Amino acid sequence: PLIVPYNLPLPGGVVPRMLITILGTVKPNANRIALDFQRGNDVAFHFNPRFNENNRRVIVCNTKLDNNWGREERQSVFPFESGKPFKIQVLVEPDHFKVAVNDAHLLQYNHRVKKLNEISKLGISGDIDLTSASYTMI
Numbered sequence: 001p002l003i004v005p006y007n008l009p010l011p012g013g014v015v016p017r018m019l020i021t022i023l024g025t026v027k028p029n030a031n032r033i034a035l036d037f038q039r040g041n042d043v044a045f046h047f048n049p050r051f052n053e054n055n056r057r058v059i060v061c062n063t064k065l066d067n068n069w070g071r072e073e074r075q076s077v078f079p080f081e082s083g084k085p086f087k088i089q090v091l092v093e094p095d096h097f098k099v100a101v102n103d104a105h106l107l108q109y110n111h112r113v114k115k116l117n118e119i120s121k122l123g124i125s126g127d128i129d130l131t132s133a134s135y136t137m138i
């Protein structure tokens with residue numbers, strides 16, 4: 001449905017209790033997926049499944065400030081499957097982003113960028129077909 005890369009505005013920034021849902025299908029032979037929550041040119045939260053990093057599947061999370069990447073947080077639990085449909089949910093909590101894939105908790109990422117109201121765009125990129133991207137308050 002939707003064109004990738006896709007930019008989803010987050011009007012007024014993120015706030016605790018905001019739930020973002022992304023539905024799509026991983027392409028065959030996919031190499032990478034990325035979600036980038038942006039504060040202007042900075043990336044507050046980069047969520048990056050990698051299908052083949054030295055023959056391993058890994059999720060890399062990080063923050064980019066002033067064009068420099070910080071310390072990576074890596075997760076070896078890998079719920080994505082080439083060719084198959086997925087659901088990503090990102091719930092904004094007071095102290096972290098909480099990510100679930102296919103209704104199962106995956107990881108939390110502590111807020112490094114603390115001006116939550118200034119994180120006002122989400123970029124979706126990589127080797128997917130994107131079906132829907134939306135948000136709501138819970």
Ligand SMILES: OC[C@H]1O[C@@H](SC[C@H](O)Cn2cc(-c3cccc(F)c3)nn2)[C@H](O)[C@@H](n2cc(-c3cccc(F)c3)nn2)[C@H]1O
Pocket residue numbers: 032033034046048060061062069070072074125126127
């Ligand atoms: O930090 C996140 C950034 O990472 C760099 S790569 C640096 C390597 O991760 C560094 N590194 C660390 C280790 C290591 C860790 C533990 C133990 C050990 F032994 C070794 N090995 N290598 C990427 O270019 C960068 N990016 C990805 C994309 C991007 C663009 C379109 C689609 C998409 F899907 C993605 N745009 N920009 C970002 O993802």
